[PDB]
């Protein structure tokens, strides 16, 4: 049931990222409205700029968390699907790889690594040959709905908000500022 | 049908390498016979040493040629077996690997390479799990005999005889010496 946990964790990350995005958008629009209002509220403008930047940092963090959760759920789905496929086709698969897979138990570390590398890149070449002809690849029937709901790739609105990286000092400063802002807004 | 050409090239390499080995052994035992005797055949001993050196070089070259041919025939057999198994179960493997394999045709170079790497090392992890659970696998049914006469690995003699390497200058000098020796023996 770990796949369901990954799925709904990704859904929660999507929800949190969207909530952060609309909060930032509302703060941006009210900041522009107040700036265009010819108001003598310099302190108000400064603290709204601070809120804007805190919201941007929170949006970046949420987008990164959602992207990593998407990667994790895709990876676990791949693990399970390939695991059952290989569990069912393993006799033929290892028969096709007998010349460099037998004796794996007693082979040395360097020999084992060389053999698995040769098997791995030969299988890579086979995958490339199969993909060359240009057919259509479909989701597994058991796990089609979850992958369709999650999507093949994360939304482009999640990668453009994570293209810039924050230094650890910036990260901790923004964490303190966000905590202070949350405490102030809670009152 | 190149597998048969690889296999009888392997057999011819047996012929050549065994001929080099037993000719070198005969020359070595004859040299030791003449050295043990009281005969003052210093020129004979010198030319015998030259012959022994060029025969060791020829044995090394033959062992290297065997290693190359054996690796080539194993690679061809692996490619053919992967082609057959992949044409058999590509739909299932694509259903397993769909989360990052569909759309590969229109993806950019870097994305294509990253997806290939992720699929490839996921398959490597699956193969490691199969090896870990400890089930033994025999050779391919279709091509069992061709790859069981040649053996799982090249002979230990072909390995330790080819362990030492020669710089290209040594290779060309030894080629010239071998040509001169062949010309002298022919007449």
Residue numbers in the entry:
A (entry chain e), B (entry chain f): 4 to 190
What do the authors say?
Phage satellite P4 polarity suppression protein, Psu, a building block of the viral capsid, inhibits hexameric transcription termination factor, ρ, by presently unknown mechanisms. The ρ hexamer adopts an NTPase-inactive, washer-like, open-ring conformation until NTPs (preferentially ATP) are engaged and RNA is bound at the SBS, leading to ring closure and RNA entrapment inside the ring. Our cryogenic electron microscopy structures of ρ-Psu complexes show that Psu dimers clamp two inactive, open ρ rings and promote their expansion to higher-oligomeric states. ATPase, nucleotide binding and nucleic acid binding studies revealed that Psu hinders ρ ring closure and traps nucleotides in their binding pockets on ρ.
A ρ variant harboring a P167L substitution has been observed to bind Psu more tightly than wt ρ38,43. Consistently, we observed a more pronounced shift in the SEC elution volume for ρP167L-Psu mixtures, even in the absence of nucleotides, as compared to wt ρ. The results showed that ρP167L associates with Psu in a similar manner as wt ρ, with a preference for the complex II constellation.
